Structure formats: C-alpha cells, structure tokens
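Re-running the complex after MR caught last week's input typo. The corrected sequence lines follow. Everything else is unchanged.
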Amino acid sequence: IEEGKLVIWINGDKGYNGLAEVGKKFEKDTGIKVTVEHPDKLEEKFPQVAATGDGPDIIFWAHDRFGGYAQSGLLAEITPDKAFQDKLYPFTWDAVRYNGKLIAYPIAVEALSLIYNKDLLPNPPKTWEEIPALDKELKAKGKSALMFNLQEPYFTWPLIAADGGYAFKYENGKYDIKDVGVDNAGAKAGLTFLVDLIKNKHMNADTDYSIAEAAFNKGETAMTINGPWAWSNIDTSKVNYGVTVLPTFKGQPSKPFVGVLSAGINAASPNKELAKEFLENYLLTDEGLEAVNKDKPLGAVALKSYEEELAKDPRIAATMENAQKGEIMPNIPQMSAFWYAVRTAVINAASGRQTVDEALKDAQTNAAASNINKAKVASVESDYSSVKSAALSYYSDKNTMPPSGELDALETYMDTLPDKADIGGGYKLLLVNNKLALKIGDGTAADSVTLTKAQIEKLLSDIGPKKIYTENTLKTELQKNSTLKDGTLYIVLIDN
Ligand SMILES: OC[C@H]1O[C@H](O[C@H]2[C@H](O)[C@@H](O)[C@@H](O)O[C@@H]2CO)[C@H](O)[C@@H](O)[C@@H]1O
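Corrected-run output:
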C-alpha cells in the first residue's frame, strides 16, 4: 500500500472501467489518485497479502467472504453516519453486519437468472425436466439448449437447493455450523439431475465461464445461467436475449444464493479516511453507481434513490424474482469451507471422479464442523462477540458500564438477545472493578457449562489470552486442563 493514493481490487467480471471513471472524478476533486485492479483469485489473494499488512485499500466481493476476513482482523470497522445509513436498504446493511459490527459498505444485490436467446427459444422452459427434450430438438440444428459454468458451485447451487439442499441451517438468529444440508435427499436429487444431463451429453463437464459465455453470445446455445454483470457482453453481441425466472425442479423453484456486492476497507490501510470518502461520497451516489452500472450491470443496487430509477427494468425484475425464491448467503467464516466442499463435489460428480452419493458425503464432511462440540464453541464465540459490541455502544452512550444483572440491559443495542450458551448455562452481566464480564453458567447442575479440553483450547485460541476466567474476581484464567469444577465462566467484554 501507499499513503495518499487508493488502490481498489474488484473481480474481473464486474464493471471495473466504470469504477475507474468514478476514481478519476475522485482524483479530479481531491488530487488523490485511484487505481482499480482486477487480480485473479482475488478473494484468496486478499487474505494472504492483507494478513501481511499489504494489499488494496479497498476490496470488492460478495458479502459471504467478509465474515472470514473480519474474523482474521483484515477489515476496518465502518462507521457511517445515520443519515448515510438511511440512504441504503436496511437488508443490505444486514448482509454486511457481522456479530454486531458493520464490516463493509453494501453496493448491490445479485442473483442468477435464466438468460435465453429469443431467436432460438421464443418461450423459455418453466422446468429443468423439459431441458433434455429441448436439447434434442436444438441438436438437430447444430445448437444446444443450455451451457453454463460448471467449474464454480455458485452456478449449480440453485438446482441443488431446489428440492431441499441448504448450506447452514438458520435458527433463532444464528447459523449452526454443524447443521449442513449438502448431503440430504434434496441435494442428491439436484446433483443427480445435473450429472444425468452431463452423462446424456446435454452438457459437458469441462464447460467453464468463458466457454459458456462465448457459446451463448455467438448464438450457439439457447440458454445460459448468469448474473447481471453478463448482460453487457450480451448487449454488444447480436443476440436478442431475455432474462427470466430459473426453471423449477420437481415442481419447486430453483434457489440461487443471493449475494450483496460489498466494499471493505483494509485494516492496514493508511488511507481509511480517503477510502471512506470515496465510497460514501463518490461511489454510493446516483452518478457513481450509474457509471459502474453502465459498464457492467450491478443488479438491484443498495442505494434507494438509484434502485427506484432502475426498478422498471424487466431484467432487474427477473433478478429480484430469482433472489426472492433463493436465500441470502451467510457471511460466517465457515462459508469458505462450504464453497470448497461443494466445488469439489460438483466437479468430481460431473467428471465421474466420484459418484453423487460419495461426492456429497465427502462434501458434508468438508463443509460442516468436525464435531458438535466445535459448533458449540463457535456459537458461544458469536454470542460473546455480539454482546461485546452491544456493551461498547452502551458504554459510549451512557458513559457508564451496563448494570450487573440481566443481559436485557443491552437489549435495544442488539436485536436477537442471547438467552442461553450452547456449551451450557445462562448469560448474565457481571461488573467487577474496572471490567464488565459476561458470566456464563451459575454453578448448578441445570445451569452450568461443560467444556472438553478440545473446546477449551479452541476458546482460548479464538478469544485470546487473559479474557476467560473461572471465578468472579477475574484472578484465575481458563487453561487447558482446567476442571471447571464450579461450571461457570467469566469473559471480559470491556476493560479500562
Ligand atoms: O462459486 C463459488 C463462489 O460463489 C460466489 O461467487 C460468485 C460471486 O458472488 C458473483 O459476484 C460472481 O463473481 O460469480 C462468483 C462465482 O464465480 C461467492 O461469492 C464466492 O465466495 C464463492 O467462492
């Protein structure tokens, strides 16, 4: 990185030339140079070079990766003023909130749609099941029915989820990282259908993003599956295209994962204030978003005033319809493991390196926590982090620590207030000397924590040294072979 200039990373399928135009307008006004790059494997390179203390000032990606980035301390907390926050749709803010803290600026909502060539297929299929028969007719003309990227699980997920597959189960405001649905009957039905399409030579296992795009834009295939960013290149081509709802599978809608394109600020950037100025006052304005959108369509933008302006576009209506039937992606750190797991399953099943049953069995193992005890610890870490953030807001506003007692003191600073720890025990607040601590458990058989040594290690590693105590004056720290005889934990949320 370099002070006095901004470097921005964004994926190559997005409108980086339009973003560069916003950067030039920024440079005009402020003299600060903005350089937009689009590295390969962007989402993997960032966490290596950021952990280093380098990388871009600003990173763009869908929101699902950002929880991992935040957990690793790679991201600067973002603090938009209330009036700025009011300019963006609340559900897009929700996508970039991680344990009570905003960790990026939301930009736009994307979901996959069915894109079809109206000159080859005046009426698109309503069902996946009728696609083999379409392909047979089209083969007669030297064409094919459908081509889309089979190397990225994002594109095959809508079909996998249709009959019941899911990533992480959501319950009581939290994701369960043990409860993964990649291996149920629904996921198997979806992936089996895909593999049958390939076995019957309706599709090719080697088809990647570039191959599918070239084929559709040259008029060689009647349909593809892609997001709003792709519409630009279809515009430039001679194809008369429509954008519509994904086909149903076994009578149920396809369920694409919904992504919110987001911009995060590198925690090691010496340019955070410049980065904040650029994002809030240049990019996230009608003119800034128009420049990006004119280059490669964003989808349904997060900025209310501009979303209204574009809302009549039938292609955006179709995007929103598919997004409605799908699910918002979790942003939790375990998403990276989920995506690696499903990529491997889809590639191996498609190429014949694993049967469908074997591929998904392995995928469930790869995607889910190793065991329920680890999932319990992740849950308690989530609770702790959320309560901490809430207690910090309480302090800054009252210039007092919360009262020792119920967690309800922090109620209006959270929405989902934690009631009970998954490791056992209830939550209370416990003010001691200069510290506010989260008390877990109350020393009774019915209300107390149990921790294995494995769990104790994980907590210590994940939460850090001198934070977890086993007695109410915060003398004795939790340690590997602690008996936890009294079944109570004290975790410091704030110290002065
Ligand atoms: O395929 C796994 C991949 O899916 C998503 O990535 C999308 C991205 O959200 C879209 O904006 C577009 O760039 O296509 C990508 C897939 O090639 C997840 O966001 C990503 O984390 C995940 O690895």
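None of the earlier attempt is carried over here. The longest strand covers residues 257-265. The radius of gyration is 25 Å.
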